[PDB]
Symmetry: C3
Subunit: 311 residues, 3 copies
C-alpha cells in the first residue's frame, strides 16, 4: 500500500487563476495525514512550481494556436505530469493526482494507461471535456483533454502535443454526471459510442445503478484496472461552490461520496485525479472549506474510508 | 412542428400581483428563441392586456360571489384563453401557455380537450387545485380550476362560468407532486378515485416510476394525447422561490426537469401550461432568475431538449 | 387512542444549554393540538423542572466520573423519565417523549421495554450513541445511552446507573441514518452485529428499502411492538440547523418525514422520542422554526398524518 500524491498546480487550461492553489489547500486540510491514517505509505511528488507556471501563464497571451489558448504551456506541463505519473505507477505506487484544472488529466491518464494498458477511465464531470482543437469555442484546454487522449481531429493537434501516447480507446471511457455537453461533444459521444451517464441517468436509475453500469462499461473481462478522474464541478454548486465552471442540478454531496465508496468497494481502483478546486473562486470563506473539504472527502472515500466498520 | 406561445398574464385567481408578469419575463429570458432552436415554428398569441386586466383586478373588490373572489373577471379572462387555445389546437399547432396563475388552466384544459377529447391531463403541483365554490376557504380561484372543469358542486358554480365545456373526466387527470392538499380536497380525490401521486409516492418509488404511473393512469389505450399543466410550486422553494404558494419538501430541480424529459420522451405531449411564476415575489434578484429560468427550462425539456445527443 | 406527552427538558448529556427548551418550543408550535387533531386524547407529563435542572447542570462541574461528565445528574433525571414512561405505558397510553438531549432515551427505552419486552428500537440518528464509559472521548453522555442500555463495559458503569433494567438486546436495535460513528463504536456495532443502516445504505437502496429492512431487523415474528427514538441531527443541517452535533450529508426533509409515514403505516409504533432540538443553537430565527417545526412534523407523521385521504 504505497501512494504518491502528485501535485499538479496548473491553471493554464482555463482563464481563472486560483485553481493552481488546489493542491496546497487540499494538503493544508490534511490530505496526506488522511491517507496515512487509511494505511497508505505516502509521499509528495512535486512536478513543477505552480507560481512560476502561474507567472508565465498570466503573462504570455501570445501562446495561442487558433482559438486554442496556451497550448505550448499546457503541452509542456502535462508532459511533466505524464512522466511523473508513469514513473509512480511503474514503481508500483498509487498515483493520487491533485489539480489544478482538468487539462492535467492529459498527463495522468496517459501515464496510467502506459503502465496499465487495459485500465478503464471513469470521468466524473458535469462536462464531457472532449471538444477538439478546431471545434472548441472557448479554446480553454481543460474542456479538451479527452479529444487529445483519444486522438480526435488529429490534423489540428499542434506539434507541441506530439508526446501524447495513443493508449486510450473510446470503449475504455465512461462518463458520470454529465449535464453541460456542447453540441459538438454530443455528436462525438454518439458517433464514438462512448458510455455516458448523464444526470438524466442518475435521476432515472439512481446513483448505485449508474456507478455499476459505468464500471462494467470499462471493465469487460470484469478484472481490469480502473482509473477515476474526478472533476468537483460534477457536484451541485450547493456543495461545491468554489469551482470554475459550475452547473445547476448536479450530484448531491451524498451521491458524490457514495460514488467513491462504490468504487473503493470494487477494489480495482489504480489511480485517482481530483481536479478543479478553485479556492479563490469562493464568495465566502465557508465555501472554500466546503470545496476543499469535499476534495479531501472524495480522496478518503476513494481510498477506503467507510461509515461503518471495515478493516 | 408548429407552436403558438399563448400569453396569459392573469393574476385574478389569487391575491398577489406580479404573477401577471410571468409571460413577459419568460419571454425576456428567451423562451421563444429556445423553442425555435428546438425546431418549432412559433408565434405569440396575445389573449388580453395584462395591465388593463391587472388594473381592473386590483380595483374591483366587489367581484365576489360568496367566499369566492373575482369570479366574473376570472370567468371572462379564462373564456378568452379557452377560445384562443381551442383555435390554436384546431389549427394543428402546439399550445404552450405561459401564466399567470393556475386559474388560467380552466381555459387551457377546456381548449385542448375540446379538440382532443381523450387527452389525459397530468397536473404537476404541490396542490390539488380542486376546491369547490362552496368548499373553498380562501376563495382564491387558482385553487379551484379542476372542480369547475370536472363539474363538481354544480349547484354553486355561478352563471358566469356557464361557458365551460364538460370534457374532463376524473379518470383522465393524474397529479404529481402533491403535498398541500386541503381536507376537503382529500375527500374529493378519494371519492372520485383520482390518480394522485404525492411527494410520499415520489419518495417511495422515485420520480421515474411515478411519472410512468401518471402517464399510464391517463393513457389506457396507451395511445392517447397528453397535456401537462405545470405549477412551478411543485418544485421545492429551494429552487423556485419566486412563487405565490410555496410548500416545503418539493421536487428537486433535477426531478422537476427529469419529469419533463420523460414526458418529452413519450412523444404524445399535445399541450403544456407553465404557471405561477411570480417575479415580484422574490426576496433577491437571484431568485427571480432562479424562477424564470426554471420556467424556461421546463419548456425546453418538455419540448425535447436533452442532455446528450438526440436529433 | 390515549397519549401522554412526556416533557424531558434535560441538557445534562451534552455541553450546550438550550436543548432543554425543546419541549417548550415544540409545545409552543402546537404539538399537543396537532396530536389532538389527529384523534389522540393527550395530556402533558411533567417529569422535572428544566430550569432547576439547568441551574444545577450549569453550576456543578464536580459531577464527573473519569472523562464522563454529569453521570450523577444524568442518572437522577433519566431514572425519573424511566419511572414516568413506564407508568404511562402500563396505563396503556402512548408515550411521546420530547427532549432534551438523547441521554433521555436511557429512561424512555428502559420504560417502554419494561412494559413491552419484545419491543424493537429503531434509532434514527447521525450517531451510534453507543460509546462506553471508559471508551467515551468527549465524556458527553448523550453519545452513550445505548451502551448503558445494552450493559456494555459493565465494570465501569457507575453505581448511580444501578437502576437501569437490562431489557434491550443487541438484536432489537436498528439504526437509520448513521454517518458519524466513532472508531470505538464501529467495532461494537460490528462485534455485536447490530443492524446499522448508514447514509451509505440510504444512498444505495433508497429510504423505503432501508426503513423496511430496519423494521424487519427488530421485528422477527413480524408482530412486535416498535419504538422509534428520533434524533433530529439525522436530518441534513440544511433542514435542521438548530442542533448540537450537526453532520453534513444527512436525510433530506422529505426522507426524514417519509420514514415517519412508513412507520405510522406499519401500525405497530408504541412509543416515540423526539430529541436534540436546540432553539438557541440557531444563527437566525428562520432556523429555530426550521428546527422546531421539523420536530412537530415528525410527530404528526409518526402519529398518522398523511398527504392524501386516510381516515
Ligand atoms: N464546454 C466548455 C466547458 C469546459 C469545462 C472543462 B472542465 O470539465 O474540466 O471544468 C464550455 C463551452 N462553452 C459553453 C457556453 C458557450 C460557449 C462555450 C468548454 O470550454 O469547452
Ligand atoms: N389550497 C389553497 C391553495 C391553492 C393553491 C393554488 B395553486 O396550486 O395554482 O398555487 C390554500 C388553502 N388554505 C390552506 C391554509 C388554510 C387556509 C386555506 C386554496 O386557496 O384553496
Ligand atoms: N460521538 C460523539 C457524538 C455524540 C452524539 C450524541 B447525539 O446522537 O444524541 O447528538 C462525538 C465524538 N467525538 C468525535 C470527534 C472527536 C472527538 C469525539 C460523542 O460525544 O461520543
Ligand atoms: Mn472537467
Ligand atoms: Mn467540468
Ligand atoms: Mn396550481
Ligand atoms: Mn400549487
Ligand atoms: Mn443521538
Ligand atoms: Mn446524533
Amino acid at each position: 500500500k504505497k501512494m504518491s500524491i502528485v501535485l499538479a498546480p496548473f491553471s493554464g487550461g482555463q482563464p481563472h487563476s486560483g485553481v493552481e492553489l488546489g493542491p496546497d489547500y487540499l494538503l493544508k486540510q490534511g490530505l496526506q495525514q488522511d491517507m496515512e491514517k487509511l494505511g497508505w505509505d505516502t509521499r509528495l511528488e512535486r512536478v513543477f512550481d505552480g507560481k512560476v507556471v502561474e507567472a508565465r501563464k498570466a503573462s504570455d497571451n501570445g501562446d495561442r494556436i487558433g482559438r486554442v489558448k496556451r497550448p505550448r504551456l499546457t503541452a509542456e506541463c502535462t508532459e511533466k505530469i505524464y512522466k511523473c505519473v508513469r514513473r509512480v505507477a511503474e514503481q508500483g505506487r498509487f498515483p493520487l493526482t491533485i489539480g489544478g484544472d482538468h487539462s492535467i488529466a492529459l498527463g495522468t491518464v496517459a501515464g496510467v494507461l502506459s503502465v496499465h494498458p487495459d485500465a478503464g477511465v471513469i470521468w466524473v464531470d458535469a462536462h464531457a471535456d472532449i471538444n477538439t482543437m478546431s471545434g472548441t469555442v472557448s479554446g480553454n484546454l481543460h474542456g479538451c483533454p479527452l479529444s487529445i487522449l483519444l486522438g480526435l481531429d488529429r490534423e489540428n493537434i499542434p506539434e507541441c502535443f506530439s508526446w501524447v501516447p495513443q493508449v486510450l480507446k473510446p470503449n475504455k471511457i465512461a462518463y458520470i454526471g454529465l449535464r453541460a455537453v456542447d453540441d459538438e461533444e454530443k455528436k462525438i459521444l454518439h458517433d464514438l459510442n462512448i458510455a455516458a451517464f448523464s444526470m438524466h441517468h442518475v435521476d432515472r436509475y439512481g446513483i448505485d445503478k449508474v456507478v455499476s453500469m459505468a464500471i462494467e462499461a470499462v471493465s469487460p473481462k470484469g478484472t481490469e484496472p480502473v482509473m477515476v478522474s474526478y472533476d468537483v464541478d460534477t457536484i451541485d454548486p450547493l456543495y461545491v461552490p468554489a469551482t470554475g465552471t459550475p452547473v445547476r442540478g448536479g450530484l448531491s454531496f451524498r451521491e458524490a461520496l457514495f460514488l467513491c465508496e462504490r468504487i473503493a468497494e470494487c477494489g480495482r481502483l489504480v489511480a485517482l485525479d481530483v481536479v478543479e478546486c478553485n479556492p479563490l473562486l469562493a464568495a465566502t470563506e465557508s465555501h472554500v472549506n466546503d470545496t476543499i473539504s469535499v476534495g479531501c472527502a472524495i480522496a478518503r472515500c476513494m481510498m477506503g474510508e467507510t461509515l461503518l466498520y471495515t478493516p
